Amino acid sequence: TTEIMQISLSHNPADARWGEKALISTNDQGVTIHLTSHDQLGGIQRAARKIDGQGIKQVKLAGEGWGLEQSWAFWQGFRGPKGQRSVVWAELPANEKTELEQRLKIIDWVRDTINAPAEDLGPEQLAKNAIDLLCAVSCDAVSYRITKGEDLREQNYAGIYTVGRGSDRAPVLLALDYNPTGNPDAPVMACLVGKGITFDSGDSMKSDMGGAATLTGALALAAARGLKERVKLYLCCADNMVSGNAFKLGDIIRYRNGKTVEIMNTDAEGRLVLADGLIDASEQNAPLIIDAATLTKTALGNDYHALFSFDDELAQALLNSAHSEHELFWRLPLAEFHRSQLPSNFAELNNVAGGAYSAGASTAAAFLSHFVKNYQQGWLHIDCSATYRKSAVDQWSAGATGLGVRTVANLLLAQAKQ
């Protein structure tokens, strides 16, 4: 019979009765959230987690202070994978209510897609959902081509075809073209390459296609905000099975750019599918290429997305977007010497450095750079380590966080001078 929980913002701290530095308090007026000057949006999100934690499922944001960002902060923390939670929003200006509504649609899409079980999300399905998303936000501007199964082998997509080899669900390359102007000669300004491993050998496993989902949301959100420039999106999608008829260990893949790659580590195959997408993206000769992949051991925890580039100014541009969108990103090393740290006894390079050069995300980024024509300027690689939460934490429920979507979209908009 309605009478929903009202949630309000105060800058005076709670009574002593609630204990020290109590973040939330609750009386007849509803729940109050107690803020200081330092990190209000973090405090609001943690409060939305606790409120959810107490088993409350419907809330009304009430009283003053509920701008776009406070409201979004709340929702990010209040929401859960089961999707039972509702929120009666506060009054907002016309601009901000549309921004809220399109964030909700597009970023919750990203969370659901990453949270979905791998049985319900195969390679071609993931491609289909991405198209469906982009065609909802702006259909006239979008076109695509799916190259699936044998068509991949037939056109020398050795990386994607090989990684997918073992499975009943055929590997898929989605090439998607977001072209607003109509002009088919219009120059391609950015290429986005996403890791779409829909099943991984060794439930963190369902987060291995999170790079694809996150860039699909980034493009969609950018377009929803009216991105004028043309953008190509490559989702490199495959199941990654290692046992038996997948024939993975020791396999050498000849890529179209002449590179040979031994598979030493049958689990590190996201970089193998990405290499093919990176070859296509470099043939477009765009001034920006961004690729995103999860799970490439990290010392940032799940708190930061990591970025790797040789281009200092471009790494800074992304960090600037990340700050403007209140998302945590952090730069990690990628120097020239990493490119030598993947030798092989049987091929030009190995897929990992292994135990001979105890490395991780820098070497994974270094490996991809062998498939980017001008790797030194205009290329970004994102290890999406803020994408998934095994268990619930302070500010997040279990599962996909949705982080990174705002930040990349902001960067593309910035390129287009918007």
Added chain:
Amino acid sequence: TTEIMQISLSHNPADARWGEKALISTNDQGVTIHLTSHDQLGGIQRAARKIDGQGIKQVKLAGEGWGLEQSWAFWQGFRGPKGQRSVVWAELPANEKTELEQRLKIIDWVRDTINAPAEDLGPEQLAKNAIDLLCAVSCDAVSYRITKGEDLREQNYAGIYTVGRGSDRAPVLLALDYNPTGNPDAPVMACLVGKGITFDSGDSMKSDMGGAATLTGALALAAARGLKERVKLYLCCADNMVSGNAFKLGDIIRYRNGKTVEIMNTDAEGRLVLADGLIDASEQNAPLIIDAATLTKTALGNDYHALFSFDDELAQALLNSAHSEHELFWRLPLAEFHRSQLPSNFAELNNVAGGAYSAGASTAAAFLSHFVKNYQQGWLHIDCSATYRKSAVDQWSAGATGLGVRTVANLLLAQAKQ
């Protein structure tokens, strides 16, 4: 523009400037290799490894001392799996240049075959390559019969059919007959039985068909040296998948000689395919049977091939060949009591001793002896533990070494009084 590196042999040790007991030195004349009286061929091989190690890819053997064995020693160490290295040989007598050229062709075949990825080398492919090799060296003398897939089940090759069961690449038995004389009644003097596991559950994995390749090279090399006697070769070939539709754990195989074998250890399946080959070889009633299998924990390291027989005089004959061909072999125990050390709760015997009789290569040899009619005379088993090098070492690059080919071929020639 040519001007190749010259490599020469000296018996005076290097200047103090190079350090103590310096093996190689380099000046305007090229690289000198410094030898003592003890183990020159070992020293030469290690020097060829270092020279390769310094990134030199083309050399000319120069000056005096470069006999057949010094030259071969060098090549063995100089060569690498990638096969970029060339050597301008020294002048040799007619006899020795043909021996060098046929060693090169046949032993490098063995290395490439063992080094090849398992994706590029299935059961039937391995059989096809072996035939191709033997028909290159002497075609008129060779005939064969391939029994593949269902034909194996249909003819009660339960061991080979079962081990291969799980895979998309069907198991294969190659029966190959090297008969020079033409006379089809000519008595079969030796049977060779090779372990051809083309894929193994748990990149050392691609070396699990090395017994087959090594005996295929042995026969080929013997024939190239004009082996007059008739020899049968059985390559027992299969993928060894253990997960899922391979249905491996606890399976009982009824062999044609009435034996039942439980599979306790799903990884120890090379002996299972060999058992079928050993049944066929014993029906030929030849005075010599040799079988070869890799990976049957060893305390010889990768430095020695191991041999097992009940026949003292025959074990000595092989050790004599091994010394004549400067290859390292070493005898390990095989007494009667080992034959009791494989009991089973559900079958006549288990495929391993397990943890009840902490054993390894002796018990594996003991198990095979239950499939050799007269196991007590005229049967040799070789655990090929010198066949593969995970990482590069003093005298060898990574990968297949090619060792054992010379030694077995020398033994067959000895049988034929040649």
Added chain:
Amino acid sequence: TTEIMQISLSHNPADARWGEKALISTNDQGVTIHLTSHDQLGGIQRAARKIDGQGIKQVKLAGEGWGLEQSWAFWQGFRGPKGQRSVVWAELPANEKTELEQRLKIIDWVRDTINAPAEDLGPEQLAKNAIDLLCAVSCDAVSYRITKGEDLREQNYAGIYTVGRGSDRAPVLLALDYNPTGNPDAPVMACLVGKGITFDSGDSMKSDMGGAATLTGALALAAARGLKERVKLYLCCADNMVSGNAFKLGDIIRYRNGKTVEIMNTDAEGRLVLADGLIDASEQNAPLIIDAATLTKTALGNDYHALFSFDDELAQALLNSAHSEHELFWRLPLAEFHRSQLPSNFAELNNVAGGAYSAGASTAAAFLSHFVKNYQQGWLHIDCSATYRKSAVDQWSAGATGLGVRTVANLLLAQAKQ
């Protein structure tokens, strides 16, 4: 009889006879090192490793190009833990030859100390060696006080006394005062706090006192270059035994600043000894505090030292020093939220985050910040992950690298406007 190997620098690449992009070549003139425009000092160091690798022990740097940095680059790579290698230097200006000679003395001290077996380097010994080093470079300016064994308990050094508890070699705090001016009222400008674990439960173990050695070298090198400002150095030294009479698991330490710390992880005890040093350093009210500790899982590899601070401008100052001294440093995250990520069921905080907040070096830095009075300005923490090499690599032999000494010394000099 002398006739030493001459090593020279060329900018033309080697003959084809040596292979592609050959770094070194060797003829009658000696070894030539072949450089391009990109990273000459890296190339020179790798060449010194290879030359050492070929077993050469005495060299003469010859011809033009051998400035201070080229010469140092060479030595860093040429040297080995066994210390058999000699180098006849090239002619240098007066300034640079003294810089070379004092680098050699001070940085090779750091390497030997870190390379020394733990049996030959107890807590008090480490303190004694540090004093000895600093008194060699400038004796009149140095004074100290050693607080050892029971004196630590008696003066509420609970962290150091507890970590050391189990061992036959008593824990030690070295407070060392480098005061050039003489004036005892002279303001203390920097405090340096070093982790001196002389034995660690679970031969990478002997590198666990590398923070202490590295800062001892930094101060010594700075003083050798005439550092005018006053600096205090705190070496927090102890054996870290965990089994039996060490009584480590679950112990709660009450520190002088009122903090209680449960020991959840008996291996993470370097931070426990540092906490006491950090309390002392904060009582000096200096505008700079630097602490250094090894082994606090990293994704930089052994290629970068990591730094953590809340002070942006100070983190940049250190990165600037690191670039001026051609050493690799890299910043890692340390935000306010990390300070909450070490809760305890039994004390104010745990010594680690554990498996509840899968973290590493950020949480270790966050933990130390609870013992720095004004942690927000003027405090740096260095995880010394470039300090030790388990095995030999491209540019380094096995063992202690000596990196970080130049960089910290440069920062102190910069503070003093020098």
